[PDB]
Design a protein around this ligand. Sequence first.
Ligand code: MG
Ligand code: ZN
Ligand code: ZN
Ligand code: ZN
Lengths: 177, 112, 97, 171, 270, 551, 107, 84
Amino acid sequence: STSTFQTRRRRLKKVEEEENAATLQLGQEFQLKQINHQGEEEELIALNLSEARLVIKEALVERRRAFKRSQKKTREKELESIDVLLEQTTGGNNKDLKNTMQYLTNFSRFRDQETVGAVIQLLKSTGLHPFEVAQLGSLACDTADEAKTLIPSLNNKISDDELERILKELSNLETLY
Amino acid sequence: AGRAALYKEVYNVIASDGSYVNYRHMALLVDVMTTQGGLTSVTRHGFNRSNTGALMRCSFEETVEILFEAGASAELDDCRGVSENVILGQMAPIGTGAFDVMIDEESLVKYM
Amino acid sequence: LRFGEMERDCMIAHGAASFLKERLMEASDAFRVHICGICGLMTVIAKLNHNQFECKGCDNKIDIYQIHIPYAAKLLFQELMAMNITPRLYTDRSRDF
Amino acid sequence: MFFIKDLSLNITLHPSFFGPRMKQYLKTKLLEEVEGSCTGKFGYILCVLDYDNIDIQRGRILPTDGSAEFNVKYRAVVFKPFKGEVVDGTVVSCSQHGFEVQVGPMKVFVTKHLMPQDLTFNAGSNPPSYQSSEDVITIKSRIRVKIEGCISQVSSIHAIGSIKEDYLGAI
Amino acid sequence: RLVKALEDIMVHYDNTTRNSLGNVIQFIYGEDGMDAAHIEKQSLDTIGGSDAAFEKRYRVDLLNTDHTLDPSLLESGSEILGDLKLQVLLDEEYKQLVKDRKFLREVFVDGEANWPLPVNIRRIIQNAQQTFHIDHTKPSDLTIKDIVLGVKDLQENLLVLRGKNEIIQNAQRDAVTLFCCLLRSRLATRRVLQEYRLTKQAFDWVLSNIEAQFLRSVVHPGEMVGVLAAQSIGEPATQMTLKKVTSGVPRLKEILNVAKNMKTPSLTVY
Amino acid sequence: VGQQYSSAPLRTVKEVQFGLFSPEEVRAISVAKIRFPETMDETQTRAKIGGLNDPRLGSIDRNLKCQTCQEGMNECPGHFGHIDLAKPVFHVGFIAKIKKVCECVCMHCGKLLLDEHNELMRQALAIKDSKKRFAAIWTLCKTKMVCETDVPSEDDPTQLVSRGGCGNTQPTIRKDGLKLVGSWKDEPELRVLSTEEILNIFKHISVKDFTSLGFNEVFSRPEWMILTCLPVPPPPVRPSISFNESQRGEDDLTFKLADILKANISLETLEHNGAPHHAIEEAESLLQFHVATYMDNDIAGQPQALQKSGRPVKSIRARLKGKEGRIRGNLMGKRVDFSARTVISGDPNLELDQVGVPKSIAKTLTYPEVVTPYNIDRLTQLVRNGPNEHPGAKYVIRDSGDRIDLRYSKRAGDIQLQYGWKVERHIMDNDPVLFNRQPSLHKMSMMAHRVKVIPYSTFRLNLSVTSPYNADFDGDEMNLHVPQSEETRAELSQLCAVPLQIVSPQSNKPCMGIVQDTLCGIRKLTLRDTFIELDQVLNMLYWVPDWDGVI
Amino acid sequence: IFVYQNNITPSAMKLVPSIPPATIETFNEAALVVNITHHELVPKHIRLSSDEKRELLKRYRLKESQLPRIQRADPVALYLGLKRGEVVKIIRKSETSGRYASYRICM
Amino acid sequence: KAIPKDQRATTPYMTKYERARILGTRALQISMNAPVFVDLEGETDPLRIAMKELAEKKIPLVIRRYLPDGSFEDWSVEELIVDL
DNA sequence: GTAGCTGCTTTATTGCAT
RNA sequence: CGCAAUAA
DNA sequence: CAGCTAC
Ligand SMILES: [Mg+2]
Ligand SMILES: [Zn+2]
Ligand SMILES: [Zn+2]
Ligand SMILES: [Zn+2]
């Protein structure tokens, strides 16, 4: 198993375990208020597809680098470029991350660490409890309704027109393929 | 001044016999009894009823009774006591185990 | 042979920690039991084969530690339980100090 | 939806590996156990970010046999679905009871009952399928579902999703 | 009983004596922080003896032809006589050796001068003696300033409690104090040069050892004193096979119990 | 040490939380209902009935089963069960307190008889100490027997302020056997306080009132001192003793429960059947008995409830009672392995720290050494050497937690050792050992000696090391303990080695010295009058091992 | 302070703690014929400021309890008139090293 | 908390237990085929080796001195003076 | 002023009986 | 299991 | 049978 910087004290009675509903009722282990290694308080880290593909790709690569500093002593085109970085710095028995990079690489809504840069700076100016932010990002939407429905937590956190503009700005930055 | 006498006596006792004991000991004991407040008998009536752990006081005279009212008063034991670990099978925080040991990765490379 | 109290005392005086613990354990009882990380108990229906761990009533399969203590210990406890007293076993202190 | 949670892990190392390239074997094994894991409270553990700055701190020695216990503090990326969570993925298998769509490392399944009625299960189809008046759903066909419920099993989380509400079909 | 009564009492790394509650029982184990095994009966000469004889022995007068160190002892003998800046230390010293006299006679009302004390300063010298084949004839080579100062230094190092603040450092002085007297007793200018002729070398050696040997005689945080001391008493308690006052085994019992009506009551009024 | 790899993590106990069982937790935990009294015999058919004994609990007959939990016998700790009493019964040991509590709270309502309104009471509610608080509390409100509704506040004795109601009088309670009775006071009105009644009054006691009176909201609720559900310890706490096959062996406790059970069933079959009302309370007092005894059988109200044979019956309390019992008996001091004992006899030929161990024993005791390229040879020799020649060994254990028995294994003269393998070998000369002579009342009672294998059956220790053991040879014996882990011996050899104990930290003086012969002789050898000539002064020099070779 | 001769009334005394801040003590005449402090056996003690005390404490990494105590009615205790909290430093002689610093909080 | 490698008060020398233990601990590991940090000049005994590793202060271990309050200090075999 | 309570040195060795 | 011995 | 707390 594995632990987490968050020593919740067990008082014999193991009962209060809510339920998970996209009513921003994420299991305690994901409050918009979690603890950083430095013992610091840090906002929940919601990662939206494609913005994830980069986080992985990058760290997954840079690993390959320090995995060799110790050796002296295009859509379907990235499918192949990833199978590489994988069968080099992964385990291979981690068949998931293989599947995750597939899905992640495929349904990605971007490409640039710049595009995904402004994407973030954009959504990041609402006050939306990180899980929303991520959703509005990795989900293709048209009306403010498609959103307010597939992302029910919203509802009263923005005037349709706004979430509309923001929804438009997305159908743009949204790099081609 | 009480201590003084308590010690004075304990001393004169081991002394009338000829035998020699070094202050420190009788002193320590004479103290253990003295600190707390007044006189604390080295008996189930005295010391073995003070705020020490439960399991400890448990291994001496009142045992079961002591235990019974341990869970009765939801007591908590530090397992700081000698006896404590002994009962548990762990290294007691005593001499050899009054501290920890660690492989310091660093020095473990500076050495080669 | 027996390593009764008298003998213990001596070792505790010597400071021979490990050794003492070793006489008490390896050369005697020494048993490995499981616990509900929550209600400090023996319950844990451990199947050390399929890994499954449960402890329903507390309902788990997640927070479970295994500990090494004397068989005369598991016993001391079970006996207290049969007399209806909860001897909780916690793998980490909280009360601090 | 996908998160980056800060975890730790206590691995016991045998005195054997108390070499110079220890810091390494610690890491190395961390990954052998973490990456690819799965818990109901952390969900799917996918990747350890920032390889070079993993904290090992001073590990202590377990009295009775050298074995040192280090508390590897770290950070990685994960994803564990939720109920009422909407995500889309590639369909995989399909049957008279529904079809299963693969959202990431996970797999969500849809019941013949959780979809619309004007969608029937085509039997004599190859490969198997479901058909609407204007639609056709099978294998590589991309859907977008609503995760109704989750069930954390072994080392793999599963869920059931519906495509009955609005805006939840093919694409 | 004494066992279970003091099991958990051990010396902590701070040099304090406590139990399973951290309850201080003795801030410095044995009011001195020394390991029993490193102690031998020494004698504080600076205490017993006539007022006359005392002065004789430890008094140094660089302003007198009959009370000055005869130049046959110190090498810089004659060139010292009269030296007023030196007689300031010689009087600064002799004044101390007397605060000592009064001090000891204020703790040991008795007059008993033989007590258990770490570091055998007695032998430590004897060794130095025949280790440098020093002859009771030739002159020294120690400035009066050499001696009196190196002594004042020796002290500074006999660290029992280490601490970095006031309170603590204060304890240091406390915990040591007595040993010192003994030290200043066996290391007075006269004694050093007249009684045991020491070269500058011999001295620097004796000094060094007194230290390093002292620092060994400290207690080791980890010593389960309680149990130790516990046994140390109930040991010669078994060897008891038995002025007409309740004494011996029953007596001890009577005590450890905190019993009301003790067989013998007595009460000595002076 | 318990065999079988456990994937679960591994920690050491840090805290011990003492509490009382909730009549529901008991259920939660329980894996067996336990309704039948009988041991089993599914119609004499040897096995077990879902009644008592493995109605799922642990098992016997060397059979894995244990509700799939497998493991069988060694490895499967106990599996608790329970049993539903008909009516509430006290707790033989808590009776003392359940009483003292009622005198502090009122029946009918359930609140204290002393509010922060009374001042002597406040001071009590201030004394932080779960025991001393509940000590003073009781001392105070055991007097007032009127659960008042109004009292003169912290203002004027002219303005009687209000609080909880019901001022009903409270009976002074007294103990009788296993029940509480109290008079309500023209003239007395004595009545028996029914457990069902007390139980309730307690349940309705304030949550913050619990607290004030040395109790805990989560671990020890007063309302728990009264037993509803009964935890039924599994086999290994009350093991059988089956003689071969068709013979019994049931433990003492296993009967007490059996009793408790029977006595219980009788009650229920009277409450849902011919219930002569108070001819039933005449049988409810029986359950309060057995379940009293099952835990404690050394009360004041004599009736010992002897098992048919006038034999007492060991209550659980009796199993823990000091000396010879679990705590002081099996935990504070156990019997050990790797230990020997014989007759000690002096010998002026072994340096202080040595200790002669008879070859007989060097072959009995062993030391587990780990195959290392530093001795991969020395061991293969011992291993093949067999366990009969002296320098040998008797066991080789491989990584695969399996032991080869060097004296039968059709491979004795074989075996290629594997780096990491453990080869238990014979004690050889110079293995540190803890050698001592009881009664051990000195730190010096036990010490570490260098082992020296020697013929003839006796521990042959040096003389000078004799007075610290308080020993002599008028037929005295001694104990010898063989260390086991590398780090172990290290502790003996570095802190326990005889050469160390030489100066006693209880008299700041040596505790060993020269005695007897060597003493009496070192005097005659001294004397001005004593002279020795060449031949001798030569042999004598030779005897001193460290002779510089300079006549 | 109030030096009663043979006694005070159980009615009287019941008004000593009724006017705080200010506090009052009662001493028997005969009980003060000789000073106990003067006794060969008794070492002089001393009070501590809420500074010196809060110091001592922090300097030994101690909690309040862990400290050795002296009875509220202890002979010496009243001589200096302590308070459930104040600390006394006892400096006495020692056959192991001249002096020895020891403290006693008051209960 | 912890405590800075500076400001520590504990004895600069190794307790007889620390040493006694250190050796044991190391020996134990040595005996378990751990890495050897000195030239086993013929030496084939662990606790023998340890005494050697420890005399060239080439032991990679750290003693964690705890205090009656919980706070602790950290010393390395290297640092600690081995007088005894 | 009367009543109720808990402990008794350490190991070991043997006979015993139901 | 309880008794009785007996060693030092 | 104390020696001492509890009633
Ligand atoms: Mg004898
Ligand atoms: Zn549980
Ligand atoms: Zn089982
Ligand atoms: Zn009421």
